[PDB]
Amino acid sequence: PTVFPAGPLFPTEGRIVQLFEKNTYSVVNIFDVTLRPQLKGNGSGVVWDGQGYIVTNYHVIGNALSRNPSPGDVVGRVNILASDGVQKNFEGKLVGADRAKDLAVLKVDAPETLLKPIKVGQSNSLKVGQQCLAIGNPFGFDHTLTVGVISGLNRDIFSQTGVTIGGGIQTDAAINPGNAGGPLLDSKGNLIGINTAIFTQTGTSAGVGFAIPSSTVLKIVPQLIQFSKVLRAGINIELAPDPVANQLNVRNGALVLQVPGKSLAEKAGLHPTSRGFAGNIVLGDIIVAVDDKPVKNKAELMKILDEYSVGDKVTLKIKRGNEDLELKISLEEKEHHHH
Amino acid sequence: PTVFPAGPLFPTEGRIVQLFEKNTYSVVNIFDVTLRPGNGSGVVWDGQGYIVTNYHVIGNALSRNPSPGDVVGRVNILASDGVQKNFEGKLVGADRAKDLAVLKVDAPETLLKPIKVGQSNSLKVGQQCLAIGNPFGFDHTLTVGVISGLNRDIFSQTGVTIGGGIQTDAAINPGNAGGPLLDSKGNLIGINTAIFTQTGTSAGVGFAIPSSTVLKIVPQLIQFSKVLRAGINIELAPDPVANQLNVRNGALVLQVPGKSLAEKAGLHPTSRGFAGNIVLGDIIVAVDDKPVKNKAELMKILDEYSVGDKVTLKIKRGNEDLELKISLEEKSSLEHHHHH
Amino acid sequence: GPLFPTEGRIVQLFEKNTYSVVNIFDVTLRPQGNGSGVVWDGQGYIVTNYHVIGNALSRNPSPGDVVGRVNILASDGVQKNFEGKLVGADRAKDLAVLKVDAPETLLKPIKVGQSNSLKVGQQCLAIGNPFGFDHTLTVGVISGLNRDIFSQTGVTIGGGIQTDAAINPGNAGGPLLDSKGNLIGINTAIFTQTGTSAGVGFAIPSSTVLKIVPQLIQFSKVLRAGINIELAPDPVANQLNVRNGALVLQVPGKSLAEKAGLHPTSRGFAGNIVLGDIIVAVDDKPVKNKAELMKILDEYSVGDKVTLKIKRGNEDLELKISLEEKSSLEHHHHH
Amino acid sequence: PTVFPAGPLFPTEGRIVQLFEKNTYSVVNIFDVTLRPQLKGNGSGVVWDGQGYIVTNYHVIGNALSRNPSPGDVVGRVNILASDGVQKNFEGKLVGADRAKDLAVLKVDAPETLLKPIKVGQSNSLKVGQQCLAIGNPFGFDHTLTVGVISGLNRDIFSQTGVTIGGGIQTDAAINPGNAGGPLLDSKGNLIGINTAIFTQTGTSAGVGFAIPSSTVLKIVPQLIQFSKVLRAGINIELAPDPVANQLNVRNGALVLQVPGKSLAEKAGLHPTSRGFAGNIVLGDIIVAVDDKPVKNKAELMKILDEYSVGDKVTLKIKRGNEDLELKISLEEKEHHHH
Amino acid sequence: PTVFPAGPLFPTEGRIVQLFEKNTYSVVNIFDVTLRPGNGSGVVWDGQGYIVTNYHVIGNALSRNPSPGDVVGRVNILASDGVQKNFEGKLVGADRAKDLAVLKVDAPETLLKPIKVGQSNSLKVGQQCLAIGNPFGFDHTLTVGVISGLNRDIFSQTGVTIGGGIQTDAAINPGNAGGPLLDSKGNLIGINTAIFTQTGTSAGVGFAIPSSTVLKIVPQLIQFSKVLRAGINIELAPDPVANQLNVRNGALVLQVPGKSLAEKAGLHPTSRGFAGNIVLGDIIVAVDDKPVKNKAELMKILDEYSVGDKVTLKIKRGNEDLELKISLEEKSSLEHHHHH
Amino acid sequence: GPLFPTEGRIVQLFEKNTYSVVNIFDVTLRPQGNGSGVVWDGQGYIVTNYHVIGNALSRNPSPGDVVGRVNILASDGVQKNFEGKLVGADRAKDLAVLKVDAPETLLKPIKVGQSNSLKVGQQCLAIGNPFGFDHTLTVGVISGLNRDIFSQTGVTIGGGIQTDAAINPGNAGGPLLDSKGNLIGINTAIFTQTGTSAGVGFAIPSSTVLKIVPQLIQFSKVLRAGINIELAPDPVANQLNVRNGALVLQVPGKSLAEKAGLHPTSRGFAGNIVLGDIIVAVDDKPVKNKAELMKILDEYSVGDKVTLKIKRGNEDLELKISLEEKSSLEHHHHH
């Protein structure tokens, strides 16, 4: 029977083939060394720079980070593809980690020649409809690719960390164990996010997955490198996710859902939402501005606070009913999902 | 490290981006007022504020027997200033059989950007399609794939299977249910429709009600608040079942409710004997003169007759070709799949 | 309607190829298995998955038995029904071959491509004819190469193509095509360990189909000689830092392999792991991983004497062993 | 190591041992012949009388009955334990079946010597707390036993038939595939019910199972023997289960939940229950008496109707709100659960 | 065939039958008024109409922050004429930590048959027990087994684990939740309590709150509407976890919330190091003078102190025996298991 | 409080026997396997399920290795902790033996009964010591005899006792006692095919424990000779109307059994079933079912020559065959 040889590719698939090939080198495989395999976690990472710094999800080395390691502790095995086409194995020493953003940084001792840093794009200028490519190196002997479009922006990631991440990219490229921790790339091969594994509420797939946007990666990684951690200042309250807030007709601001016992929030004058014995619902305060740096949703509020330091005193502009009130509060050090 | 700014888009992703942005305005958000923390998307049908969605997105409200005029939804519509504005959605009419509902919003015609509607009958498997949603009233969603199949049963979360549906490999989910499926020219070719499968298992394809159906049902709901259908109360085999039984042309009669018009007319159903030797229920190949290829077509053909009408059914009863006559009556029975 | 370039090309490729994609109903199943197949040649040979006629195959049919009803789309747009008589089947590769008695005019054999030159990122079309009344299409890219397929036959197939086109009952047994419309694999239904979908599916590569199908036509089955040992799948091996060769995991009591002097992999109580031999050469022919070793031994026959070059820890040893028929197929236990 | 021999048993366990042994002979095994086994339905039945009549659940030969068999058709393989201690295999020809009560009768051609009829007790005089023994012969090579107490009376059985059976016995003896179709016996060895397999709403076991009471078996079996079937007359409406009715504060009568299109019920003047757009609930009529044979719950109503014949005209005494109204209706021939 | 009439009952089944019938009257039915088609059984506590049940059977009503006096339940009580009569159940008080709630019914003392309460502290594994329910207000249910275990954690469907519970192999289910567990003399030894397990899997045993707890909590709810507890906000290891870590005496401190009284007092928690070498958090062996066997006992001991009180904790820190002093404050934190 | 007769007897039987029921924690498991065991004798031998120390056993411990921590209830009401050193293990019967170094005064060996004289309907007590701080009890009746146990080791054990006393992690590895407080089996955790509970549990009969435990003490393991064939479980066989003997289902290629001339069971395509040979005699010793055949062959050794009397259809044939070590344990695949 006649076998037709590989012929020229069409323009679009041709470009994807080239983008994938070129970026394979920048996508590493990571094995969590604390896992005794079945001899009868883990995933991908991205080469951050020529120094040997590696970026991955907190979760891909979750089990290891659950053992309270200090910087320098060998926490991963890293496989890096060389020009020779073969993957070389390196010690991944822990640099820093941040569970809230499901990001972890490792450092490798490797020849700069061997290391090919990912190109970084701007996630803030992404448009729904843009092509994206999710690359993985899940086992350190090959690479994987899924392709789809930016499906939504500024969506919550229900990370398998257990903590939900605000401001996530949604894509209809398949995101799975084969690419978790690896890069989401745009049509130019620029990193626009980190493929992030999630848990859904139900068992059924909605056919879409998620990436931590590069804007967040750029903000977090250097902090992890310098300080091994991100110290955050904020308010220990529970705010409504955009979907809940909007369903309750809160179109603007951060709706306060809960304000726990004797909290700083309590003492400053902030009210939660509830149901009365009638079945009536009683809306909580809505934070519209910090000082008066405008707030329009939960996620942006978090990003406002994440930059102040502990003890900073600020002025919350709030909405309760139709009124508009200013409130003082001091910030202290800064939760999960049911998935 | 160094940050590279938004580059120029390639042609295909470029078109998709512009089609999406252009169509955000026509894709509204609907919250069922009877729910607390259904719900999903809809489509601006015309400049008068008529809104089209799935029966299922306002299913809870519809179950409580509301009357036309009742506020059953809160409708969010994207204005040119980029913020979504809120409107009461009054019920116009609903049709469970086709999983469609129509609401009416009181808004400035200057606000409303009616969706552009195309012809689903000309669709080709392989064509690009975009499924758009506005599931929470604060942004929009997109998925993209191809037309994967045509004339397929939709196991709607209504509990009632819809025939003649479009299959796509664009992800169809709660984030775009009730929203439009568009072709590459941005014409509406269907309404994204949530389904239940028999298993807990994704086949990786989704479904939409074809625009040809929407075009037929919506004006009736607007004019009458409901769809009156003439038909025959019998159970017909789904196409995959009929073909498995080697019935390659016509609609196969499976079950015939006791003392029905069908029974009195002498229509025979389908029975697996204790040995195992199948007599095939009658097979309907023609209504009067016009040929019937399958179940979907029989339904489509009948839907154009009136409740008074007496028709002649040309049927295959085993080997022989025979004729039975029957009066059509209001087609009330619903086709319940029992997927969950 | 008028169409844009890429979608225009898919629409035409799909239409052109519908004729070569048949529908198969397993005749041993009563209504309320089953799927698609491909026309292999003008004599009426039809290729499909073992699994799409699995029920019939479980009943030990002989070649010539009517195991399926086959529907084939004719030039006039209607599908015609034919008796599908069994030609041969191979559970190990989840492939089966039927023969229909039909006119050449009806039969449009699929064109076959070269799966060994595939590149991740290439467009693929997965086509089905699930019910004999229409055809289905899903479109994605090649997502991965040389991946294990956990076939619904219950047996793991090495060397599979991974794609992010949806592979489902609507196209199982059907062709996976490249952008030239050349067959690059056969869409193959799988069971996952969990059930949670990863958004990717699998196809047996056409190189395997090319190897197996003529043997089924001639002999009705494929006989294999090998070694009764358990080899490490690639992920597990590369977790243990074995980047080359077939890592030997388990080694049976009193086996040919034992007699030959080949070591299994052992976790000692003192928490440690010690590595089984790694097979890197069969008759000095380089062995790259498990799938490669399997491919290589499949070319021998029962009784043949071969020389294995193994890596025992940091050593280099050459063993003798005689190949025998194997005690099992490789059963994953996914459901 | 020293091994102590079987010694005398204590009184209670001694009696159970004896009851079990003695009744094994009366408990048969039934294989549904339409099932091709895995060569690389079904359960137990009870010997009804010396004629060879066998009583089991509809469900244990469910697959066979799904093929529309006529009386006389060989529908089961029956294994009967003989004094010799060995089970002998017989043809089970279908006598009759009733899906609504999940009962089926088979007839065997066997030596009267071989057949040991079960002793039948009165289920109507059962008391919660009484000891019960559930016996099975699931495979025709041994027998099984579970022991518990009557846990509740007049409870719905959500049979694996798909149809719920009113008036069932609840027991905390384990009811399972090992005894489905077999007898539930009281402390004297008298048959008080037929162990009946069910589907639960949720997946969690409540630790209790069910038996069709002997009162029902006694009423149904002879009809199946004479007529191969039970013809029933009734009203094609949907009535509320006791638990729902009581929760809505209907303590007496049969609460009408649904009255479908153009039904006899429609035309006679019967109303269903519903929720209004408010979320308000609107109670349907409550049938308190047929003619004036008092009704106090769904189950007793069914048992009133099951004795009239088709076309009989009766007078429903109903409650709507506070009033009390009489209603005429003619009965026609006579539904499932979501489990 | 021939029908044999009700024979005489044997002694054990005979006793069970009479105990059950006798106790039906004390076992009421409770419907949460905030639910539509929670709910279960309760126990008549005294002749004044005080009703005892699980917090969980009226959980939905309690979540809406009702005040004492609010009608949160419909209570059905079996009278001597054999019919259940209906009463408004007004909330008296609830305690989530012990999964107990008290309602108040306005009824003729002649109607009310208070349950007889026994001593759970004298219970022996192997004793016969009966679990009675009145789940729908039209009859009663019974299950029977033995006391299977003592002082076991109850993973209450409240979401909060209760220490010191009774384990039985009588089936405990929605049909008897909130109802009494009785001994062979018909004394109340516990309240049947619905649980969540970690798996979807029955171990075939159920749980009840011991009467010793009920005896302590109920009068407080009647007098005060709530229970005030003095304690220490720290996380203590469940007994099965402590023993697995070879801590065979005392309460093992797992976690110590940042800048708590416990922290400032110098109590050390438990940490698994990156190598793997466990330093055991402090182990509390005595409060002041009185010895502490395990976690349940520490809680029990603390519950008798007052919010003012300063106590001396004798602790095991690795090998050495040490003392840390701490003021008790209101024990607010709840112990959430996360089973579903 | 004062107690009624039957409950009084249980309470006392339970208390008296707590001392003989120990707690075992598998030392290879880090906290947040494990269960109960029985004191076998005054030298400190402890019997439990293979599965309760399964993790440790997976790591290939040698006899003498500390595989468990054992807690034993002393006369003063507190449990004392001891190193549990491995003596022997047998996965096939889900049994393991440990040895503790303790004073005779501490050790109260369980009294052993006769499982072969058990009657359905008898009272049984299932006792546990799951955590080393108390004991648990469940009470039921003997519900069935000679039933397959689908052990959580993954291997099916024939000849098991079925009871409607709850068997759970709280008593796995612990004793099942009769009304005299005699050991009649070891409570054994199982996996069911579905997961849906049938309200009954299982115990390895003391006759099996009696047979296995001394061999583990002497030799650390049990070696078995048998036939590499697949035998029909009793339900399946009695569905096919085989009421006596071991029905042979599967028969490997080039097996000793094949060479011997023994037929498998076959479903022909023409819808029919044809019966594999039924083994009814090993050296003219009557074979009643699968479990009996297994018991019988376990008494031989590798190499022994035996005569099988089979029933081939309506025939009567006598074959020769040599017994070999077996290629597998019998794995159900329940989870």
Author numbering:
A (entry chain B), D (entry chain B): 104 to 143, 153 to 446, 450 to 454
B (entry chain A), E (entry chain A): 104 to 140, 153 to 455
C (entry chain C), F (entry chain C): 110 to 141, 153 to 455
The authors write:
Deg5 and Deg8 degrade photodamaged D1 protein of the photosystem II reaction centre, allowing its in situ replacement. The functional unit of the HtrA proteases is a trimer, with three protease domains forming a central core.
The catalytic triad of Deg8 consists of His171, Asp214 and Ser292. Trimerization is primarily mediated by hydrophobic interactions and hydrogen bonds. The recombinant Deg8 exhibits a remarkably lower proteolytic activity than that of Deg1 in degrading substrate.
